[PDB]
Every structure is written in C-alpha cells, then in structure tokens.
C-alpha cells in the first residue's frame, strides 16, 4: 500500500501543508485518533480537536519549515525526516521562555525562533498519520533578533 516512495512523499506533503497555513488541510493528514508528541517528553496530544488547538498558535506565528530528505526504511509504515523551522517569537515563545528553553528577547514583536527537530511519523495503510513523534530540546532552539 504505502511503499517506500509513497511514505517519503507523504512526509514531505506534511511539511508542505504546514507551510501552506491551511489548518483543515493539515488535519486531513491525521487519523481521527492520531497521537502527537511535540516534543517527546511532554504529554501527548490526541484527537483532531487537540491537534487543531496545537497548530493554531504555530500557524499564527507563520511557522515555515525546511524539510530534509526523508528516510523510509523497510517497515512499510514509518517515515523519518529532519525539519528546520522558523516562526515568530509570539505567541508561543513566552511559553518556551517561561520553561527555560530559551532566553526572552529584547523585542518579542520582531524576534524569531529557529528550531531543528527529528520527526518519526507512523502512518496506517491508508496513509493517514497515526502517530507523530517530534524530537527536540533546549539545545535545538535558537532565538533570532
């Protein structure tokens, strides 16, 4: 069903829809009970409702992603891909700064956050995402400006 080539392109399609900014087109890639961990280590996010509330503040920050070449593997359900992200410091930045993940900038209205992350995406035979794990921490976060 979802072979090596299709699994790789579906990973890049996800990052493409993130850049497009249309929430409904993003949620359409997820199964109704899909689990998101962003980042791994914090409580997971389950369901389309919760996925919408997770992405809305990021889209409002004009999140843009530069995807690397994905890895498909032999398993017929997974795809791994490295993502380099940039977004407005507001509105999520203060949440990160209050956790100690970055230092607050002198001009939050104009500052920007860069991030590098590793995605582990598990899809079903239909191609919908059932589980997405994003790995990143303090050392992968940088405040610009």
Automatic annotation (TrEMBL):
User: What organism does this protein naturally occur in?
Assistant: Streptomyces virginiae (Streptomyces cinnamonensis)
Domain named SnoaL-like is located at 15-78
**InterPro entries, per the entry:** NTF2-like_dom_sf, SnoaL-like
Q: Which SUPFAM superfamilies match?
A: NTF2-like
Protein name as catalogued? MonBI
Alphabetically ordered keywords of this record: Isomerase
For this UniProt entry, the molecular function terms from Gene Ontology, in alphabetical order, are: isomerase activity
Q: Which domain of life is it from?
A: Bacteria
- List the coiled-coil residues: none
């Amino acid at each position: 069903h979802m072979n090596e080539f299709a699994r790789a392109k579906r990973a890049l399609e996800h990052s493409r829809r993130i850049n497009a900014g249309d929430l409904d087109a993003i949620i359409d890639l997820y199964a109704p009970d899909a689990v998101l961990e962003d980042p791994v280590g914090l409580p997971p996010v389950t369901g389309h409702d919760a996925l919408r509330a997770h992405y809305e503040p990021l889209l409002a920050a004009h999140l843009r992603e530069e995807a690397a070449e994905p890895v498909a593997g032999q398993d017929a359900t997974h795809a791994l891909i490295q993502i380099s992200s940039v977004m407005d410091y507001l509105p999520v930045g203060p949440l990160y700064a209050e956790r100690g993940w970055l230092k607050a900038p002198d001009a939050p209205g104009t500052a920007r956050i860069h991030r590098t992350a590793m995605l582990v995406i598990r899809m079903d035979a239909s191609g919908l995402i059932r589980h997405l794990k994003s790995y990143w921490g303090t050392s992968d976060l940088t405040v610009l400006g």
